[PDB]
Amino acid sequence: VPLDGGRFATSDLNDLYRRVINRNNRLKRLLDLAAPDIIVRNEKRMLQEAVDALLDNGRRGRAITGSNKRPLKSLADMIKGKQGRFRQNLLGKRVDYSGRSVITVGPTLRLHQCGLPKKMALELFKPFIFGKLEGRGMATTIKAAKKMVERELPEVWDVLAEVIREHPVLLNRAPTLHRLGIQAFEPVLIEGKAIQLHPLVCAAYNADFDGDQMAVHVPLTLEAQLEARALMMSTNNILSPANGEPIIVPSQDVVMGLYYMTREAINAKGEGMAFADLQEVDRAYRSGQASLHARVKVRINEKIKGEDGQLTANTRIVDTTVGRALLFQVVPAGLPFDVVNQSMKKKAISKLINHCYRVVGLKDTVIFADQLMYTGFAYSTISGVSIGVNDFVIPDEKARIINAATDEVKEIESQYASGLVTQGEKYNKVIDLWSKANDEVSKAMMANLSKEKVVDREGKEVDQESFNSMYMMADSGARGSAAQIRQLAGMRGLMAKPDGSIIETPITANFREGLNVLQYFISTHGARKGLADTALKTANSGYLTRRLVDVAQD
Amino acid sequence: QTRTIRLPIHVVKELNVYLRAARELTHKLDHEPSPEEIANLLEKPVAEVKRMLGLNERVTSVDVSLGPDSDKTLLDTLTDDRPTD
Amino acid sequence: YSYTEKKRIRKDFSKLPDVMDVPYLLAIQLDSYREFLQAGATKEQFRDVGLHAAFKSVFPIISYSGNAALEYVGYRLGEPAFDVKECVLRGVTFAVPLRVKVRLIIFDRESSNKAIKDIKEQEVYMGEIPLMTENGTFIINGTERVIVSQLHRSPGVFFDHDRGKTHSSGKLLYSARIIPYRGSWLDFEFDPKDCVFVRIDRRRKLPASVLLRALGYSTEEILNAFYATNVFHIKGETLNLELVPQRLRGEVASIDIKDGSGKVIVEQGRRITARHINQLEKAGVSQLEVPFDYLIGRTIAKAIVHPATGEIIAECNTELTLDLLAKVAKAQVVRIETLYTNDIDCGPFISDTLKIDNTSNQLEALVEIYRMMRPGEPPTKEAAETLFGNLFFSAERYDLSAVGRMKFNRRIGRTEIEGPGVLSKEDIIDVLKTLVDIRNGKGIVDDIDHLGNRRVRCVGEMAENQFRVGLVRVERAVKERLSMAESEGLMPQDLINAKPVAAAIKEFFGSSQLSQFMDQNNPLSEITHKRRVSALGPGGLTRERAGFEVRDVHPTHYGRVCPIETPEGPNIGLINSLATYARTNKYGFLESPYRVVKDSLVTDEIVFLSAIEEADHVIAQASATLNEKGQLVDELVAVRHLNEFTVKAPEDVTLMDVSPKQVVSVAASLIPFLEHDDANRALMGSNMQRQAVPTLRADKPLVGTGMERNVARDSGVCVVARRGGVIDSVDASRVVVRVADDEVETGEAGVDIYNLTKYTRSNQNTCINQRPLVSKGDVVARGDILADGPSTDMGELALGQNMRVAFMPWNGFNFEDSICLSERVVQEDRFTTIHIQELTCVARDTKLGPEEITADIPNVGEAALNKLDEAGIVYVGAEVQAGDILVGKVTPKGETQLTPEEKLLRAIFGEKASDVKDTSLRVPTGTKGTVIDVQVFTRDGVERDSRALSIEKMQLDQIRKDLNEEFRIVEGATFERLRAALVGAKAADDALNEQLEKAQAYISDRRQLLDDKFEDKKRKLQQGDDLAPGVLKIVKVYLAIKRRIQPGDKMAGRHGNKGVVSVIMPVEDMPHDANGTPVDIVLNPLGVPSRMNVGQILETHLGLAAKGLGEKINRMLEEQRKVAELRKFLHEIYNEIGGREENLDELGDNEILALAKNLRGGVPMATPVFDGAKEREIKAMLKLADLPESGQMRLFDGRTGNQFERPTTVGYMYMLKLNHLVDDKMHARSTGSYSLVTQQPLGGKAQFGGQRFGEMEVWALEAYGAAYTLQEMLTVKSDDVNGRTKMYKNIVDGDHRMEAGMPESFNVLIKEIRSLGIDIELET
Amino acid sequence: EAKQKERDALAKAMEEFLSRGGKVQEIEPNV
Ligand SMILES: [Mg+2]
């Protein structure tokens, strides 16, 4: 193929074929003149090396081309050099009808549908518009229909939405480590330049909103549209393939609004009254005369599905909170009221969806998962939970443990100056003192953070669960665990060195009181070693899943 | 047999004296060999030296990739001239 | 006090005063180039360490069988032709002439001073020096490129262990490979079988017996030197063993020793305990009785030869048997050599490798060492000696530095300070005896990961070795040509050759890994890029060879590099940023200054400590309380002596830190409240702050650090005043200032022309401009700021714009990290940046016809040529859309061979058959803007159009109108001084006549400097720039696109909280407080308990108090208050809780209102890195600004209208805008072009790019029950010829037939297999 | 060290020709 400026481009495989013909013709000419046997062996040895360099190269021949130093890739070297001794089908293949863009969370979308920009839908469904304009009668030929989609007329958007109504498109992230990485969704024409994704489905993709890109795919054959709706739909893969736990679980933002809704309080506004049904609880709450969580008593008409094909009706007068009665409206008529009487934590709600899908079905579970997310985001905005400097309650007895441990370590150093204790004994007798002192700090913090509430109701003093913003984001399991709260309230502990040994000097200060200069340099050892193993974890785990699928492929 | 395109004998001898004249003029002027500079020294028109010096294309390989990392060769960067879409 | 300080004053919260200011940040790049270029002209004999030292090693030459020599006095550096602003406009590289002087010395090689001729003449311009600017960068072909510092290992010997799982051994000696400053390295690795096998960098393993024989020593003496520490003699009772108490310690004694004049030592069958070692040392005996049956397991050391029989009765490495002792007893052997080696000793390993390949003589090692040097070549006694002796004596490229000799001798122990450069026979036996000592357990391995084993290079040292290679080759051709030809007929101009010098220095600056592109997307990114120490490069370790030994921080990096400033991704830990106070030493090691402290008083002088000089003294921390007396008042202080952080006493301290900000880098010190954030978010906060984009309006950060002024001042982007004086006239294009009478010369006192740069294109397609911030008639001192650059506000670094930020989950829009913006951030045009994208067109020359820029285009209309001119260039300022014609470029062609179907349409509509194809330049889809300027380029001997005449006319009118206006300023400045001679008051006499003629001559002389420059500038416009062969004319345009913020962009702060904006909610939906101020950004409070970044809440609380104080002054200023009411309230802010502030210095009514009008939108605070404000100093600010104490106020809902039943944390938080917009990542395609061999979609059509469907997505589709889906994305959608065309017709018809087809990835594999002689067929 | 010492001895040798009588040839500027 020529290039710019009249310069050609010859492949290296053609050079090997031309070298053989230059020597094969000389063999026929030399053998037609009664040449001596000494000169015939010189030509036959050159023909052997020419054919040897044509099949493979780099082993013993290593032919060097002109104006360069790299060896020429032969035919057998082309198969080895094809994506590293692999085939073109087993490697990455460029496909059509695709596109990548930045993802964006959308709380106004259903579980089976997603978002799609208007400019992307015109390029992906381009062959589908030409078929609809000719069948309708607006476009006569296919050439006139091309100028209608590029002119952005007012009649091309009405015909475009006709093929987007029922057309499951595929979505996938860059790293695919499980089957839930490729799910089919129903695209909805939205305005913008981003893919509007569902908040609940983000747990399966394991992707956060920080600049991630997800590619799209449009199936053309109707045979592929049926197997993408019945198998690849987001409503079908509601259970993880690993275990029986569902993969569509309310995330940290949804579980925060549901935990505050189902809570117990000692004294509240509107406590002690009764209601006729669930319709009276919603009216009394939105009127501003009843609190969100108050000890009341209501009578509900619950239905139990213990008998197959029969739905009995029973009336029970239970005494629960105000918010717990509002959450039962979302729960269908196949589950009792005891499943919503708890605090509705993260692990306590993952077993409710697994139980709802097992005793009701799939059609009523997808609608229940969407209404649970709608009532989780609406009640999370009403309660303006915020983290501040007063939420990090530092225990007043924390300074007593540090000052006591500072006097015990000085006694060990005063003994080591004489020599009655060896170096190996004093090292283990001081590294366990700080480990034992870390438990007393965490025990004194959890006892103060949980009881950080003082209320009164016709009495002097009454204790209950604390309503702190930090405790709600840790007990509910939304984000973080109990091991991360110890770094903010209490001391961090003994930051071990990446060499294999633990550093004796601990970090007494926390994140609120501020770290020192030498105390912050020690924290850079464990933080830099954690990032070095994270980038290497994608190569070792990716290599483990690459050998198991090759033996378990048949 | 050196070049990939066989050139006739009556035209390849004209390029032998052009390369030797450009070799002496390279170190004599202490600069890059210009296409119009050799035309004035050898008493030749500018249109004749442009085609003769431009005949040597010096074609390079295609499978050899450029850069420090060999992620893709030149085979995956070329396109056709006819209608392929 | 500076003039810019009086305008805006930041309140500092530093509790301790700084005894040393921040030095120049770019001092590592400027000081490294002044030694290589040597632009300073002195009157004395300067040393000029650098290129001048390497140039002195060229003239002295030695020629075999001849006499030739040269003498070089020095070099001369010329002035550059193109300026700093013209070299970036046109295509040229900023260079400078380098003329040297070489004197040829011809001799007769007769060892006499007779018939010697010398000619002195200046040589040709040997290459061109880059001559970089004062900003630390050099322009190469119109682009700014910088060179990062290289980090390589120090020259010396290093011993390691390399404890890996592949060796399957707990103790295994690693390779004791030495690394010289230049040349090859010797890889000497100890074999796991107690053997030594040396190797080369590109050769196989060689035995130790072959390497020891090449040095000149015998194999028997070398094997007996490290072994045979005991001798045996036949005296007394036919045997006498040397009694050593160390050998018998812990070993059983099966031989009775009855010697000792009746004093027995041990008995037969008794174990030697701690009691038997006391009876042997108290007597001091050395001989004992040993039976002949005990020597059956011992072996000999060397070949025992007797002088009686003349033959070797016992060869080396043989056991002493019974029959062998009978021959040695009758031969009268004097001394028996037995290598006393046991399990308790170290054990000699030279005997196990001495029998390798039968290398018992020096002749066998010569023929074996030549096989690895030359492959397949014939072995010769002369060629093998030259190759073996090239690394020992004939060191051609085995030179070592002066510090490498003392470093290698310090590990093995040597009294000599400096020795020979190359390795000698005595200097090579120490590394062999030091490896066996570390193998037994005596001593420890070397420290390679510490700072004492690594050396930081520079730009001057990297360019010196690249210039010496290009110069050592040019002298080889001049030496051989001078002896072949005559000396009288030859000239030094024709003998020298500047081609290998200019070629080796130009291709090095463009094909090197260290000479990467300089990013100008942020002024902070410009400083942190030059202040980088890279490890990989020309000679360093790659990302795989490094492993994990260098990806970990070490305590030796305290105050030298940054542990929290490292880019995460494919290469983490390899490259690292330099510290703030880090200063390079003379040898190149990183040295950080400390404060020496004594037990009497703290000293004021500052000393610089090296890396290896820190293990002797103890260094304390700057966070120590003082009793205002100069002593350590604290009872304990955290110090470090053996590179370990621990506690020590304040009585033996010797060193102390200067400032706590000497550990972090420049990109990490600007983060407020860094002590409250985790190191994981501090590593990510320095990367997002570096990728900021300058917005349209520069908003100062209310919560700063104080180092923001030191980043924008030392940079070469702001207009810094060189001299002081009064500003004459302020204009948007340029600014002029006067020169004071104190710091002025005799003639031409007031001369200061500062040309402000306009909107030009940077290296990241971002806009850059300078706006004047001074007024006419202002007193400007030396070192002030006259104009601010991109993302700078009044000399302060202002990357992003701050706004009201609330922390609450708002309807799930802030799900994980998303941002919920408001409509007030888009209507006010806050995050709307300006991008400058350029487009260049070329004019190729083909044999079918030359390409020219014409006006007529085939198959176009009037609307396409409406915005075009009569020459083919788009007008300046014409609004172009996606798909318009910018430059008219036509390409002639022949032999079209049109089809009869197309010929029928050419006659109906009356379209003429144009034989020239239209290949004009067009803008891509989605890129629309306004052309700011058009730059054209022409060649010599080519005709120009009417468009190029208007460009040279505007350049000639601008260079003439400005030079005529600047001459009027100097003309008026000379008459005002001459008019000051009115002491006589005529309205002595000889003095005023000379001054009048001198003032008239100065005006006439100044005109000659402009006339010669105007004619020189006119020549630059009439000449054609040098371009690549094959381009007739290059016309490039510049578009200006304003990319406003839209849902999809990436926004983040300074604490490492990335976020993609979701939607733009209206003003009525944003939560508002009781006053009615709707918030703009609604973050997510769930990131605080998960990610340990508390600085987000501390900055939000200070941001609310900073705006509360600024709003109080705005209300007080508009209330028509007096002067005593404003200065009293300002004094209650700067001096309320702490900080160093000075008052009672501003003016009464001028400077007070000038400072109140600048703080009416918020009082900026300065919170240091580790010396920041405590919780009391922050809570006390909320009480003064009439704000809640806890900082959490309940807000009203915007949509429902009710009140939230929980306090919400509000305030102002600084936010940034990253260059990850959706306009450069969103793309889609259905059909396009394909390749030739493999029918796969690719780019080139300027439409979009297809994504790769890797194997990871193949296993996912197979996990489901998908069969036709995966078969479609492999055969129909790609790799097909007939399947794709037939499928496209099925979509238009309406029925999906789904033809089978055949993949093209398998049809190519069949043709490649059948061509290899192996058959393949389809049986079906 | 060794290279600078070689020209230093030649510089002292060339200076000896100035005393015994000798003038180094001077050439005008090049092209
Ligand atoms: Mg992500």
From TrEMBL, chain D:
Species of provenance: Pseudomonas aeruginosa (strain ATCC 15692 / DSM 22644 / CIP 104116 / JCM 14847 / LMG 12228 / 1C / PRS 101 / PAO1)
Name of this chain's protein: Transcriptional regulator SutA RNAP-binding domain-containing protein
Domain called Transcriptional regulator SutA RNAP-binding: residue spans: 2-31
